[PDB]
Design a protein around this ligand. Structure first.
Ligand SMILES: *[C@@H]1O[C@H](CO)[C@@H](O)[C@H](O)[C@H]1NC(C)=O
Ligand SMILES: *[C@@H]1O[C@H](CO)[C@@H](O)[C@H](O)[C@H]1NC(C)=O
Ligand SMILES: *[C@@H]1O[C@H](CO)[C@@H](O)[C@H](O)[C@H]1NC(C)=O
Ligand SMILES: *[C@@H]1O[C@H](CO)[C@@H](O)[C@H](O)[C@H]1NC(C)=O
Ligand SMILES: *[C@@H]1O[C@H](CO)[C@@H](O)[C@H](O)[C@H]1NC(C)=O
Ligand SMILES: *[C@@H]1O[C@H](CO)[C@@H](O)[C@H](O)[C@H]1NC(C)=O
Ligand SMILES: *[C@@H]1O[C@H](CO)[C@@H](O)[C@H](O)[C@H]1NC(C)=O
Ligand SMILES: *[C@@H]1O[C@H](CO)[C@@H](O)[C@H](O)[C@H]1NC(C)=O
Ligand SMILES: *[C@@H]1O[C@H](CO)[C@@H](O)[C@H](O)[C@H]1NC(C)=O
Lengths: 437, 437, 437
């Protein structure tokens, strides 16, 4: 097992690039319900009475409308952060990085990346759900909105303001900018920079010198390409990968099913049918039975609305988090641990998903650690010398200085150290020569 | 359109300082409702019966009380982060920066900044709203609280614990500290520092050397002053700028209006008036009709309470975000992209607003980009040299090194580069002389 | 009072390490309620009727189940971030830091730290609460779940998936890793490093050179040890320190008490007892009275469920914040102001608490500030020199350069300054000699 030591340090001699996907729901289907059609359907005697209950219907209808509008804002706040659409890079001559699975391709009319085309297939809408049956009733015609609503007990699904194609186009712009302009494309003009240099400068942000990339550019490129390939298989095989997006769809479907099914409930009355009770009873007695169904059908709808408001808040938080991660992880480089995947964040790539966003985080994780003896300071000519950058390490009989995240032994010289103190205060100082550079 | 290139880099030759306002709601009006006065008003027969319904009234009353207390905490958590009130700086001899529109002035008794005096005028309370009518009924007297509540169907608005003047005083302290003590005033004692130096050190935090400020101090000062002037006009002209704060006020007003209006509803009864039904009917029949209004007037109030709880959660999240932004953007310098406005964050200034906070974010955005040929490394004497800071750029026949966010060509010397490798591994290395400093 | 000055700077000559605790609720008791036992208990006539009300019971039961599952996820997302359990460090020979109050000890079978053993005692469950009475009814037996539920009006508390011991074991692993492997244990392999070096490198992250730790290691160690001792007394004495955790427990207890007490309510009927009304009335009249209690007992339970959903969202946000702070504050070093305690964040230590987490944040706050005259640049041989790091300060007749967060006057030399401009542009430049290093 791991054991502490007062004079031993472990420094990584190698590295492995990894890509970790994170899926967050961003929006919900713009479902809506009419309160004067769910309770009373075609009946004129049930409406007159429902007016005496005041604003109850108007309150629930307005609440659902707010949720629908919130879904449009949620999507805009995430994907619309950049609207200076960057043109796709036609030069397929990067330094080995094969974005072919990340960027779109022309071999299909959907203009979606191979990963996006898989995500859009893993999430599906069942034929038993009213969300699909309502669409078949319209047939893209808008005039039959009220006709289909009357058939589906007043259920109405509004069309999203931004189509799936618009979201894909916005995501492509973010990708092209990051690949061609780095993190600065989101903080100003399209300051183009070569991608190998961009990675070299991102390495310096995680304490790794630019040298490591250039001397390992082919190896680093191969690692990135393999990681992007493996994630596609992982999502394809694992059926419960996009559960976060499927769960929100399933939850909304169950809510509508329970709401519509409750119309078949008597709530303590002679029947669930308003024409049957109104024909069996006389007027001075039917209104007692037609008041029990109205009150049961109002609490049912109120339960649906209140549950949707709670669910909408969860999606709103996820959408805000997604927008924050797009800015920090995609448009920049987040130093915050675990915010842009495991390991040190280098860069991330966004991918569109149905009612959600998938972030591909590229991170640097050290590997192949090796033990080395270390000392806090070096003593020379009575002066105590400290490392300006990196750590002092001992290769048996010799002492060297090296980067903390990559083993690179260098001779201890005045150019990489600084001096302070009379060598009598630093506990554990070791005597070693410092050469003049 | 923008095009990628493997050997071209764009570096900005100039900069434009910009100020972007962000408005967040922090609190809500401390509205409260009594459940034994909304349903039954002055009637003793309606109360006896309302007791049989158990704790329903106590649950709703306690819920509203919690919301009111939460509003006080929300404001305290945002503005009370610093309470060592810093004295206003009477020396109007900064390095050109004209905070006169940001700081208070003595020409008015409100002691609010010119921007604050505009924000407090763009948000207004209508005379038709009960929030104002309740205040006119009290006339600052506290003894008539119960008398005015009985008139307004039990509606009662509690006074905020912190007055608008207290919030302004707290904001002034934060401003004076930031202007006179920088980001350290919030992490320890009032370590005073000259403002030009403070900006010079904030520039170094965004990759821009201190030199750029000193050689452009007058230009930078003029840019800041113009930006602070333009924002005042923007808020004055644009009527939908403070909508986030007006929307929460409007939403609460509509909720009370719908609640009070529902008292005029029969909920399926002989009349909405309890004395009328109780006088027309005998006792063994009036209780059937006085049970239908109690149940309608309880779900109405329950709908108001539940909707307020959902709205209070949204304000709580905004208040927490505002407190986080005050610490990160005002008391410090946030590296997180888009968290403290567009562009690289330099500093921000807080301004008080009715039930909200307005953050003025000052950011650095590069401008006037110019294309330059770049190489990843320099080859000299067979050794490959890499840039210690900045990027190598070619001015036609000559190669230079320059900062990434400001064009400053310097001769390539050992003092600004480091060496590694035998010049046979770096792809794209170029041969150029490195001079001895 | 503090006063601004254009040529004076304050630099701290000393420092005081401080430890500030932050308590956040992470989970809630897995309470659950059966909807066909709260309303109708043992009665077969009340169930037949309750079926006509449709899915109402199934909706409320499913909602409570989701909350219970959410509590398990909340705890896992916070504590399970690391599962490579690090072995306790048996070498009690650190550089003076006495973690004995932070780490567990073997003198007790609970295997909890002295601070953890106090936190687990300050929060208690009253004997009048059903949460305890339900446990006494089971006696650790699982077969009597349904029997005890029938006695407690259908109330059922589920056992947590992770026991208190498992949470303590996970917290110990995080502590051992941080003490023996620093922030890298959470971003890769267990890269061991000596603790004094780890603190020396964390100091460099707050602008303080490693020198300050080594020359003050004994003083810094003593300060840390004293701070850890004082916090234990603070929590022991202050009774309202863990209120955030006690409040959530109290709120849930009151909710169940109000729910169960409402069974004693007539809701406008002949009695709250179903056998009494069903025996006094004939069948064609008892169903009118047995429909009024069902509807009152359904809105009561619905009010409990909706309030719990609102409360569960608050805990979910706190749990997410706790997980974020564990990653940023414990597994790393957060530059974000006020996110990991007052002052500059050095490191933090986690401690388990009942249904919550306590973070011990160790921060650096400067002290003993001293005024010094400063200049933005130095003029020599007509060239304007700027400080590469730190600030220029004047000790009366002599000019020196020093770190911004620690007074360390050094001679101005080319090794600690850089040159730019012709000395005619920098406003406030002072003439002083720069020596050749
Ligand atoms: C580092 O790891 C990679 C894994 O792809 C391996 O190919 C390589 O040989 C290892 N060593 C070095 C020095 O790169
Ligand atoms: C990128 O990967 C795909 C995988 O199918 C491959 O077809 C393509 O040739 C690769 N690109 C290059 C330049 O080899
Ligand atoms: C490093 O240690 C090995 C093992 O003792 C030795 O063979 C080698 O020469 C050492 N390195 C140098 C530069 O002497
Ligand atoms: C940079 O932009 C400012 C805009 O105010 C302009 O005055 C100035 O001439 C431009 N060029 C330089 C070198 O500052
Ligand atoms: C600051 O701006 C205001 C704008 O009205 C102006 O009156 C004032 O003179 C300015 N300050 C200075 C020092 O010029
Ligand atoms: C930079 O390029 C221009 C255009 O060729 C040239 O006139 C100028 O002399 C170059 N700079 C230097 C320092 O030679
Ligand atoms: C700094 O503060 C500590 C407080 O513990 C004190 O012991 C010490 O004498 C002070 N001065 C120095 C130079 O450390
Ligand atoms: C650590 O503190 C405890 C406090 O009771 C003390 O008993 C123990 O001796 C201390 N450790 C050392 C090494 O002195
Ligand atoms: C610093 O100032 C004091 C007071 O004038 C003086 O005694 C001392 O000699 C100065 N330091 C140096 C290095 O001259």
């Amino acid at each position: 097992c791991v054991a502490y030591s007062n004079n031993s340090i472990a420094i990584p001699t190698n590295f492995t690039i990894s890509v970790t996907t994170e899926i967050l729901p961003v929006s919900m289907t713009k479902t809506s319900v009419d309160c004067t059609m769910y309770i009373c359907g075609d009946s004129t005697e049930c409406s007159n009475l429902l007016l005496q209950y005041g604003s109850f219907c108007t309150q629930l209808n307005r609440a659902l409308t707010g949720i629908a509008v919130e879904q449009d804002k949620n999507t805009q706040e995430v994907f619309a952060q950049v609207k200076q659409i960057y043109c796709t890079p036609p030069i397929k001559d990067f330094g080995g990085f094969n974005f072919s699975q990340i960027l779109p391709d022309p071999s299909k009319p959907s203009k979606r990346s191979p990963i996006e085309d898989l995500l859009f297939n893993k999430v599906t809408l069942a034929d038993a759900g009213f969300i699909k049956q309502y669409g078949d009733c319209l047939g893209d015609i808008a005039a039959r909105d009220l006709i289909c609503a009357q058939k589906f007990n007043g259920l109405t699904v509004l069309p999203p303001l931004l189509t799936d194609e618009m979201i894909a186009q916005y995501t492509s712009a973010l990708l092209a900018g990051t690949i061609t302009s780095g993190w600065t494309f989101g903080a100003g003009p399209a300051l183009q920079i070569p991608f190998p240099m961009q990675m070299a400068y991102r390495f310096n942000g995680i304490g790794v010198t630019q040298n490591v990339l250039y001397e390992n550019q082919k190896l680093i490129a191969n690692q990135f390409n393999s990681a992007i390939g493996k994630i596609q298989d992982s999502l394809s095989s694992t059926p419960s990968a996009l559960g976060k997006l499927q769960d929100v769809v399933n939850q909304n479907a169950e809510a509508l099913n329970t709401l519509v099914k409750q119309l078949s409930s008597n709530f303590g009355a002679i029947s669930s049918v308003l024409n049957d009770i109104l024909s069996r009873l006389d007027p001075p007695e039917a209104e007692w039975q037609i008041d029990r169904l109205i009150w049961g059908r109002l609490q049912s709808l109120q339960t649906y609305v209140t549950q949707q408001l709670i669910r909408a808040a969860e999606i709103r938080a996820s959408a805000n988090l997604a927008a924050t991660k797009m800015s920090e992880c995609v448009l920049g480089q987040s130093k915050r641990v675990d915010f842009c995947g495991k390991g040190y964040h280098l860069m991330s790539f966004p991918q569109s998903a149905p009612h959600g966003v998938v972030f591909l985080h590229v991170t640097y994780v050290p590997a192949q650690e090796k033990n080395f003896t270390t000392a806090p300071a070096i003593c020379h000519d009575g002066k105590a010398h400290f490392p300006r950058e990196g750590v002092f390490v001992s290769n048996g009989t010799h002492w060297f200085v090296t980067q903390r995240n990559f083993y690179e032994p260098q001779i201890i010289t005045t150019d990489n150290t600084f001096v302070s103190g009379n060598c009598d205060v630093v506990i554990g100082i070791v005597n070693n020569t410092v050469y003049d550079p």
